[PDB]
Every structure is written in structure tokens, then in C-alpha cells.
């Protein structure tokens, strides 16, 4: 398993322009396009990033470049934060896998924002920052996928996508 099957899982693949769980229009895997409440200006924002007029729709090999991007962007911005990268760089090839999962949904800023649990990976305290992280709205509001995420912190294994 890597990074991209994972995420892949858990975000699904839409080549239709869609509402995500909090009501964004996205599209591909996970790709948000807007916060903004009409779906013109999804249809807009699509257009420039395909730059093509795709009359909301896209490919599958669209889906994968945007896909491929936004990876890319995740990892370069977990290396430039400082609060990020300082525990990025302490854990293991797995654990880091779940880093990027947290950053792609919710963004840099979002994650940075949980400093009491990056604290505990940071010292590798692995229980422990399993239960400080289900304290949070993340956890409320996609339990499923939040507890994946968590189990591979709290276990250092593929387990929880292994079912999938």
C-alpha cells in the first residue's frame, strides 16, 4: 500500500462535479474546487484548472494529474512548515503516510492547528496521541475515515485499509 492507494480509498474517484461531506464542490479524488456556494463558479474554477471548458466533467487521467498535484503539494507543505516538518521528519514511512492523509484533507494550517497531538507523535507516544486526536470535529464528522487514520498512527501498519 502507499500514499496514493490510500488516499484513494478514502476520498473515492467522481469525474462529475460533486458536493464533498461538508457541502464543497469538488471533483476527481477529493480535489476541492470552491467553498463558494455556486456551482458556476465550480464550473469556472474547473475550467482553469483542467484548462479545458469541461461543462463539469472531467477524465479519468484528469482526475489523476489533479491527483498527482495535489500529493505533490501536500508533502512540499508539510516541508514547509516548521510545526510539520519537525515531526514529519521523526516518524516512519507508514506514520508518514498518515500525515499526508490528515494535510491533503484538511490543509496545513488545519493539522498545524492540532499541536497537543503532534507533541505525541513527536515522542512517539502512539496510544496516547490515538485518543487525543478523536477529540476533535475532524473526528465528529468523518468517524470512519478519522479512525482509519488514527489506527494506522496508533499501529504503524497498513491494517485498517487492509479490509478495503
Request: proline letters at 1%.
Given at each position: 500500500?502507499?500514499?496514493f492507494?490510500?488516499?484513494?480509498?478514502?476520498?473515492?474517484?467522481?469525474?462529475?462535479?460533486?458536493?464533498?461531506?461538508?457541502?464543497?464542490?469538488?471533483?476527481?479524488?477529493?480535489?476541492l474546487?470552491?467553498?463558494?456556494?455556486?456551482?458556476?463558479?465550480?464550473?469556472?474554477?474547473?475550467?482553469?484548472?483542467?484548462?479545458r471548458?469541461?461543462?463539469?466533467?472531467?477524465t479519468?487521467?484528469?482526475?489523476?494529474?489533479?491527483?498527482?498535484?495535489?500529493?505533490?503539494?501536500?508533502?512540499?507543505?508539510?516541508?514547509?512548515n516548521?510545526?510539520?516538518?519537525?515531526?514529519?521528519?521523526?516518524?516512519?514511512?507508514?506514520?508518514?503516510?498518515?500525515?499526508?492523509?490528515?494535510?491533503?484533507?484538511?490543509?496545513?494550517?488545519?493539522?498545524?492547528?492540532?499541536?497537543?497531538?503532534?507533541?505525541?507523535?513527536?515522542?512517539?507516544?502512539?496510544?496516547?496521541?490515538?485518543?487525543?486526536?478523536?477529540?476533535?470535529?475532524?473526528?465528529?464528522?468523518?468517524?470512519?475515515?478519522?479512525?482509519?487514520?488514527?489506527?494506522?498512527?496508533?499501529?504503524?501498519?497498513?491494517?485498517?485499509?487492509?479490509?478495503?
Amino acid at each position: 500500500m502507499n500514499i496514493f492507494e490510500m488516499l484513494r480509498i478514502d476520498e473515492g474517484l467522481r469525474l462529475k462535479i460533486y458536493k464533498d461531506t461538508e457541502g464543497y464542490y469538488t471533483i476527481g479524488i477529493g480535489h476541492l474546487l470552491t467553498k463558494s456556494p455556486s456551482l458556476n463558479a465550480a464550473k469556472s474554477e474547473l475550467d482553469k484548472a483542467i484548462g479545458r471548458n469541461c461543462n463539469g466533467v472531467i477524465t479519468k487521467d484528469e482526475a489523476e494529474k489533479l491527483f498527482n498535484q495535489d500529493v505533490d503539494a501536500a508533502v512540499r507543505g508539510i516541508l514547509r512548515n516548521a510545526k510539520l516538518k519537525g515531526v514529519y521528519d521523526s516518524l516512519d514511512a507508514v506514520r508518514r503516510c498518515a500525515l499526508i492523509n490528515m494535510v491533503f484533507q484538511m490543509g496545513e494550517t488545519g493539522v498545524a492547528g492540532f499541536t497537543n497531538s503532534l507533541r505525541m507523535l513527536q515522542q512517539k507516544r502512539w496510544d496516547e496521541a490515538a485518543v487525543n486526536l478523536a477529540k476533535s470535529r475532524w473526528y465528529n464528522q468523518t468517524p470512519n475515515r478519522a479512525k482509519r487514520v488514527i489506527t494506522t498512527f496508533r499501529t504503524g501498519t497498513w491494517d485498517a485499509y487492509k479490509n478495503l
